[PDB]
Amino acid sequence: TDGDKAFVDFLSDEIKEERKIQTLPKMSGGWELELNGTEAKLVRKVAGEKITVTFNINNTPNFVVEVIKNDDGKKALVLDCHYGDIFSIREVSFQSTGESEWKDTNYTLNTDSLDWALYDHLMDFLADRGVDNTFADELVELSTALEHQEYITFLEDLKSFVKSQ
Amino acid sequence: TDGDKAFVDFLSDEIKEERKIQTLPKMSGGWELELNGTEAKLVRKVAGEKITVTFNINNTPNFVVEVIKNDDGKKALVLDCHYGDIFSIREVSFQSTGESEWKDTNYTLNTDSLDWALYDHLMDFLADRGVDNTFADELVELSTALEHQEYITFLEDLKSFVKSQ
Amino acid sequence: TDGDKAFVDFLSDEIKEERKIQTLPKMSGGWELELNGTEAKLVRKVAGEKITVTFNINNTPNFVVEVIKNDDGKKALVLDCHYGDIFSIREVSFQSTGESEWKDTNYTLNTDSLDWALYDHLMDFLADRGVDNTFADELVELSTALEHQEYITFLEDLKSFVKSQ
């Protein structure tokens, strides 16, 4: 098709321009990064605790913190958080680790009009585990670089797709 | 951690205050209550019919009515309803009982601009089965008490979690 | 019940009125139609390509285009599209064919502020495969007729349900 091979030439140009524009920055705090396509996991084991921060660059942007007390590995404290605009906690609950789905029947603390004092203690709980406003600022730029890399990979996949046959 | 044990002391105070503030009221109509964490089920078997009202106190608040004609147990009439502000029916469809998921391919009657006459007959159909505005008012206070009990249980779980180690 | 048999008589009247008001139009372009209740699939195999347009009349209205290059059947280009108001592409990604779920970890091109030039090439890519504004206009009337047929079937199912016993 005329359109297809022109679309391929155009995608070639876009890939050059976006690579030229340019890598992944680091997170302070001894985190280890695990990439699964658009999903990133930052991991820290400290003092009988595993802390996992999970975000997906496809999506208001959010990240999920999972705190596992290694004494009792079946139930994790899960804190859904906003980042970018403001940091802030949106929801807290206990979940089974490694489930295919949030148990809808476990209680979820929505923070919408939450007592400022309980809210601040929750923020301090996160800060003590490394998830502070510095972490949230560093996450923005990691997320931003990761989105650009995956977008470039997508243009390549699209170019390869359209050029096949 | 300094913060952790202070967070525990604060949660201790909150648990006392919320229990002090204070149980589950009853539903008129011979309903039986089954609690699964934040999900409640109210059940009635009357005249060849099983009526199940399901709501989850995590979440505009809604409840689902499931009518099963005991002659043909495979397909249930499902009425998604709003409660609190106004009663009102939001959606009606037939679903297989005991499915893991709403069959997306079964027709769903959205009530958004629904003929008032069909709407009123649907309201009368529910009222005949006990789901009236009295039921919906009683549900608000049952839901409200159930949310408070589960929130108290959550503070205890949080306090226990943070205090461990 | 008094209400039930009156509801049955009323549903009888509604079914007559809606059938009286009146079938499924055709899609230009050699498409084959497969109905699964409220989900419709339009299918075309052309030049080493399978094109599938899927929409569900329950639901802003949208349809999904799936392009499979028969050389490599494991990954399909998926274009989520709006129809009715404007045509337009909302999201593009690669997905495994025949999955139970969108892989959340595959990159999704949201078109929200997308470069007009990449957007137009995507529109041309669809148009070359038959998904043009003519197709989208024809789809509106197919969807509209299909919703009416399924609604009539729903009134019959409701009438049959309420009349049983």
Author numbering:
A (entry chain A), B (entry chain A), C (entry chain A): 76 to 97, 101 to 137, 142 to 247
Question: How is this structure described in the published paper?
Answer:
gC1qR/C1qBP/HABP-1 is a multicompartmental and multifunctional protein that undergoes spatiotemporal changes in its distribution in response to various cellular and systemic stimuli. Although it normally functions within the cell and plays an essential role in mitochondrial biogenesis by virtue of its mRNA binding activity (2), gC1qR exposed at the cellular surface serves as a route to gain cellular entry for numerous pathogens as well as acting as an inflammatory trigger in a number of other diseases including vascular disorders and various cancers [Reviewed in (1)]. Chief among these is oligomerization of the gC1qR monomer into a toroidal, ring-like trimer. Although these loops are disordered in the gC1qR crystal structure, they themselves are rich in acidic residues and project outward from the negatively charged face of the gC1qR trimer.
To address these limitations, we used the existing crystal structure of mature gC1qR to design individual deletion mutants of Loop 1 (i.e. gC1qR-D1) and Loop 2 (i.e. gC1qR-D2) wherein the entire acidic loop was replaced with either two or one glycine residue(s), respectively. In addition to this, we designed a double deletion mutant that simultaneously removed both Loop 1 and Loop 2 (i.e. gC1qR-DD) using the same strategy described above. We collected X-ray diffraction data to 2.2 Å limiting resolution and solved the structure of gC1qR-DD by molecular replacement using the published structure of the wild-type gC1qR monomer as a search model. The asymmetric unit of the crystal contained a single copy of the gC1qR-DD polypeptide from residues 76-247, aside from two discontinuities in regions connecting α1-β1 (i.e. residues 98-100) and β3-β4 (i.e. residues 138-141) due to weak electron density in those areas. Although the final model contained only a single copy of the gC1qR-DD polypeptide, the structure of the gC1qR-DD trimer that exists in solution could be reconstructed by applying crystallographic symmetry. The structure of the gC1qR-DD trimer superimposes well upon on that of wild-type gC1qR, as 140 of the 165 Cα positions align with a root mean square deviation of 0.544 Å. As expected, the primary areas of structural divergence are found in the areas corresponding to the loop deletions. We found that gC1qR-DD behaved as a trimer in solution and this arrangement was likewise visible in its crystal structure. Intriguingly, we found that surface-captured gC1qR-DD bound with low-nanomolar apparent affinity to both FXII and FXIIa. Thus, while gC1qR-DD clearly bound tighly to both FXII and FXIIa, comparison of this mutant to wild-type gC1qR strongly suggested that interactions of these ligands with gC1qR are mechanistically complex and likely to involve multiple contact sites from each binding partner.
